[PDB]
């Protein structure tokens with residue numbers, strides 16, 4: 367499985383380059399993927415994310431982290447298979463978990479025709495920007511390479527992957543780590 371990293375509160379300055387404990391935010395995402403079973407990583411970039419594109423080219427230039435260019439998943443062109451689309455702000459994300467998500471996705475198609483939604487119980491996640499009847503989106507999803515409709519299932523984990531949308535969000539992010 368390969369992966370896609372999707373890249374204005376708190377200033378609307380590109381977050382992915384926001385710095386936490388000396389590392390940019392995206393490094394935290396990239397790190398798990400690499401240790402990650404998901405081998406190739408595609409980092410979708412866009413304007414105001416130019417600086418990001420650069421850090422990435424320069425930073426992972428020696429790597430196989432490739433940059434791509436509302437919601438455009440003008441990226442299906444790349445994956446011939448279902449990929450993991452992750453936001454560029456996750457905290458506390460681990461490869462072990464990831465194995466489970468991708469592993470889980472298939473166990474299912476064990477009985478299916480898809481997209482997967484990974485959500486955290488509210489008990490685990492605090493100060494959630496979004497809560498859908500008690501489930502908080504982790505910003506990690508499995509998807510198929512299509513531009514239309516997908517039958518999306520839901521996966522639940524008691525682990526917490528926090529995403530940052532706000533500055534206070536950052537405090538918590540640092541508190542976690």
Ligand SMILES: Nc1nc2c(ncn2[C@@H]2O[C@H](COP(=O)(O)OP(=O)(O)OP(=O)(O)O)[C@@H](O)[C@H]2O)c(=O)[nH]1
Nearest residue numbers: 372373374375378410411412436437453454455531
């Ligand atoms: N290139 C690109 N990335 C996006 C776009 N929308 C969301 N993302 C990425 O997907 C992740 C989840 O979206 P958000 O957390 O809402 O990012 P955001 O839109 O900058 O946040 P806001 O300040 O509320 O607008 C973010 O880390 C973004 O990097 C987009 O339209 N273009």
